[PDB]
Amino acid sequence: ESECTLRALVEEYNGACKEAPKEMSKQFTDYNTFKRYTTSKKDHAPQMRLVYSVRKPWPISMTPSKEIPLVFNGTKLKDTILDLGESKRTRANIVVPDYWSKYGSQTSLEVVNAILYAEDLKVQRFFSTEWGEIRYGRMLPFRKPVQACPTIEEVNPASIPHTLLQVFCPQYTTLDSKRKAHMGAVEKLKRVMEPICKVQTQESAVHIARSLIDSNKKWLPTVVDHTPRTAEMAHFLCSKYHYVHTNTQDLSDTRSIDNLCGELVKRSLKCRCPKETLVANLDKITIQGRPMREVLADHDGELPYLGICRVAMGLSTHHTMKIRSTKFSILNSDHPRIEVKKVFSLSPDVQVTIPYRRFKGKAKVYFQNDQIQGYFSCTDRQIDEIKISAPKNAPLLEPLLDICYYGSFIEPGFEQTFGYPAGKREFVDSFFMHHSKDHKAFLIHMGLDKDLSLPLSPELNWKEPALSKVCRVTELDSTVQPYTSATREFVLGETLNVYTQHENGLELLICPTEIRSTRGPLPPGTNLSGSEFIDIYQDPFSRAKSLLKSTILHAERCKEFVGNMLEEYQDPAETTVQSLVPINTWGKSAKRKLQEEITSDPDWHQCPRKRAKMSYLAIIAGSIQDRDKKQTNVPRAFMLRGSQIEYDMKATRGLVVDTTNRIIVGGETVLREGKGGPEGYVQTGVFEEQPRCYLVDTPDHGLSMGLSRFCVHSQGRYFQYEKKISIWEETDNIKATIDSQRDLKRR
Amino acid sequence: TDRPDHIDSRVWELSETQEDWITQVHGHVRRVVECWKYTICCLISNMHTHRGAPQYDVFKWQDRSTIEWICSKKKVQYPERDTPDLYDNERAVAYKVLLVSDLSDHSPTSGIYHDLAFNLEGEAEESCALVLRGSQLQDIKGFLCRALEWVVSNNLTQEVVETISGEAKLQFSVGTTFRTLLKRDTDWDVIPTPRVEPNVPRIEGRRWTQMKKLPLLKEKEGPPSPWRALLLGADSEYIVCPPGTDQEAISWIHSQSEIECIRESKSTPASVITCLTSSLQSFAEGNPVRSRIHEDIIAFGINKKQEKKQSASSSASGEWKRAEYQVEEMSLPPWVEEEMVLLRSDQEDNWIELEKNAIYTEVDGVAEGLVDKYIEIVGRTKVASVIEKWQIAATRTFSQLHTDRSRITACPIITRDPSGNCQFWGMVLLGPHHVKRDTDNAPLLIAEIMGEDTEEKYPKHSVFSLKVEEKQFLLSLKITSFSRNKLYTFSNIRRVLIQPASIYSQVVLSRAAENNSLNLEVNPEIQLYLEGAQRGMTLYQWVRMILCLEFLMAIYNNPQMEGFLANMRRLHMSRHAMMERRQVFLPFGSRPEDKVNECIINNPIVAYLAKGWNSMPNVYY
Amino acid sequence: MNLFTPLSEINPTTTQELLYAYTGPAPVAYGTRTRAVLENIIRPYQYFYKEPNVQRALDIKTGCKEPEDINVEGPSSGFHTASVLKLADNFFRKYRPAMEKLKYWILVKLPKLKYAELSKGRQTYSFIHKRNLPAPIALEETVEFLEQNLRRKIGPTLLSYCQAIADVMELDETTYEGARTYTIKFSREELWDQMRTLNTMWKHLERGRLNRRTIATPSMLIRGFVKIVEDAAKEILENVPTSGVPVGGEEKLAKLASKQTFHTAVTGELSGDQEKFNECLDPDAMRLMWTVFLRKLGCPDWIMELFNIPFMVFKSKLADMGEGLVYTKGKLTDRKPLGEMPSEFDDLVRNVVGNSISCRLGMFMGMYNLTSTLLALISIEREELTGSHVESSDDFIHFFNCKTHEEMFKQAETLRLTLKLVGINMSPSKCILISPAGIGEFNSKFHHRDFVGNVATELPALVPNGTNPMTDLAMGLNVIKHSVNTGQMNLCTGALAMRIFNHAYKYAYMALGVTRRTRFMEENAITPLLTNQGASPVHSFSTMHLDEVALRRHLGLLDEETLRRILNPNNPVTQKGDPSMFFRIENKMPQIMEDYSVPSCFKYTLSRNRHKALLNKEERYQRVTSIINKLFPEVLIQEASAPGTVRESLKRRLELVVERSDLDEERKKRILSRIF
RNA sequence: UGCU
Residue ranges with strand state E in B393-438: 404-405, 408-416, 422-430, 433-434
- The number of angstroms, rounded, from the C-alpha of C135 to the middle of its chain's C-alpha atoms is 13
CA distances to A135, A322, C552 from B370, in Å: 17, 42, 25
| Residue A276: partners with Cβ closer than 8 Å, 6 or more residues away | none
| Structure resolution, Å | 2.6
**Which of A55, A180, A740 is facing B399, going by the closest CB pair?**
A55
DSSP conformation letters of C250-276: HHHHHHHHTT----SSB--EEEEEEET
Contact residues, chain A, for C576 at CB < 8 Å? 63
Of B294, A236, B351, A729, nearest to C543 (Cα)? A236
- Tell me the nearest-neighbour CA distance from C624 into chain A, angstroms: 6
| Cβ proximity of A467 and A450 under 8 Å | yes
| Residue C600: partners with Cβ closer than 8 Å, 6 or more residues away | C470, C549, C566, C567, C574
Name the maximum alpha-carbon separation found in chain C.
95
CA distances to A448, C116, C162, C289 from C224, in Å: 65, 10, 7, 20
- Tell me the nearest-neighbour CA distance from B492 into chain A, angstroms: 11
**Which of B367, B502, B505 is facing C541, going by the closest CB pair?**
B367
Distance (Å, rounded) from C-alpha A214 to C-alpha A147? 9
The angle, 0 to 180 degrees and rounded to 10, between the axes of the packed helices A587-600 and A608-621 is 150
**Which of C18, C288, C498 is facing B357, going by the closest CB pair?**
C498
| Residue A208: partners with Cβ closer than 8 Å, 6 or more residues away | A118, A193, A196, A200
The reply to whether the CB atom of residue B247 sits less than 7 A from any atom in nucleic acid chain D is yes
3-state secondary structure of A362: strand
Q: Which residue of B has its CA nearest to C64?
A: B187
Distance (Å, rounded) from C-alpha C452 to C-alpha A717? 58
Experimental method: cryo-EM
Q: Are strands A694-695 and A710-713 parallel, antiparallel or unpaired?
A: parallel
Across the interface, whether the CB atoms of B135 and A744 are under 8 A apart is answered no
Of B246, B127, B234, nearest to B458 (Cα)? B234
* Nearest nucleotide (CA of B494 to C1'): D3
Contacts 24+ apart (CB under 8 A), A569-574: A571/A622, A572/A532, A572/A533, A572/A534, A573/A534, A573/A535, A573/A547, A574/A622
Q: Which residue of C has its CA nearest to B202?
A: C67
- Tell me the nearest-neighbour CA distance from B47 into chain A, angstroms: 6
Number of alpha helices (DSSP H) and beta strands (DSSP E) in chain C: 21, 21
Specify which residues A338 forms β-bridges with.
A358
| Cβ proximity of C64 and C421 under 8 Å | no
Residue ranges with strand state E in C354-424: 356-358, 388-391, 395-399
| Cβ proximity of C482 and C544 under 8 Å | no
Residues 493-552 of C with CB under 7 A from strand D: 503-504, 506-507, 512-516
Neighbours of chain B (3+ CB pairs under 8 A): A, C
The radius of gyration of chain B's CA atoms, rounded to the nearest angstrom, is 43
Distance (Å, rounded) from C-alpha C206 to C-alpha C219? 24
| Residue A227: partners with Cβ closer than 8 Å, 6 or more residues away | A144, A146
Q: Which secondary structure element, helix H or strand E, spans residue A372, and what is its range?
A: strand A372-379
Q: Which residues of B284-302 are buried (b: 16+ CB within 10 A; e: fewer)?
A: beeebebebeeebeebbbe
Which residue type is seen at A430? S
| Cβ proximity of A171 and A713 under 8 Å | yes
- The number of angstroms, rounded, from the C-alpha of A443 to the middle of its chain's C-alpha atoms is 45
Å separating the CA of residue B384 from the C1' of nucleotide D4: 9
DSSP conformation letters of B279-310: HHHHHHHT--EE---TTHHHHHTTTHHHHHHH
Give the angle A74-A76-A80 at the CA atoms, nearest 5°.
Answer: 150
3-state secondary structure of B234: coil
- Tell me the nearest-neighbour CA distance from C28 into chain B, angstroms: 7
* Nearest nucleotide (CA of B416 to C1'): D4
Specify which residues A501 forms β-bridges with.
A506
The reply to whether the CB atom of residue B392 sits less than 7 A from any atom in nucleic acid chain D is yes
Size of interface A-B (CB pairs under 8 A): 139
| Cβ proximity of C414 and C406 under 8 Å | no
Q: Which secondary structure element, helix H or strand E, spans residue A734, and what is its range?
A: helix A730-745
Residues 346-385 of B with CB under 7 A from strand D: 349-353
Report the Cα–Cα distance between both ends of chain C, in Å, rounded. 77
Specify which residues A144 forms β-bridges with.
A220
Contact residues, chain B, for A742 at CB < 8 Å? none
Alpha-carbon dihedral of residues C398, C399, C405, C407, nearest 10 degrees? -70
Contact residues, chain C, for B21 at CB < 8 Å? 107
* Nearest nucleotide (CA of B347 to C1'): D4
Which residue type is seen at A500? T
3-state secondary structure of A448: strand
3-state secondary structure of A638: strand
Report the Cα–Cα distance between both ends of chain B, in Å, rounded. 59
Distance (Å, rounded) from C-alpha B263 to C-alpha B270? 8
- Cα-flanking dihedrals φ and ψ of residue A67, to 5°? -75, -15
Across the interface, whether the CB atoms of C103 and B22 are under 8 A apart is answered yes
| Cβ proximity of C224 and C165 under 8 Å | yes
How many CB atoms lie under 10 A from the CB of residue A283?
A: 20
Distance (Å, rounded) from C-alpha B472 to C-alpha C353? 68
Give the angle B262-B266-B271 at the CA atoms, nearest 5°.
Answer: 60
Neighbours of chain A (3+ CB pairs under 8 A): B, C
| Residue C525: partners with Cβ closer than 8 Å, 6 or more residues away | none
Q: Which secondary structure element, helix H or strand E, spans residue C442, and what is its range?
A: strand C440-442
DSSP assigned state of C634: G
Å separating the CA of residue B382 from the C1' of nucleotide D4: 13
Alpha-carbon dihedral of residues A169, A170, A173, A176, nearest 10 degrees? 130
Of C204, C184, C187, C189, nearest to C130 (Cα)? C184
The reply to whether the CB atom of residue B296 sits less than 7 A from any atom in nucleic acid chain D is no
- Among C13, C22, C203, most B C-beta atoms within 10 A, so best to mutate, is C22
| Cβ proximity of A710 and A685 under 8 Å | no
Distance (Å, rounded) from C-alpha C663 to C-alpha C659? 8
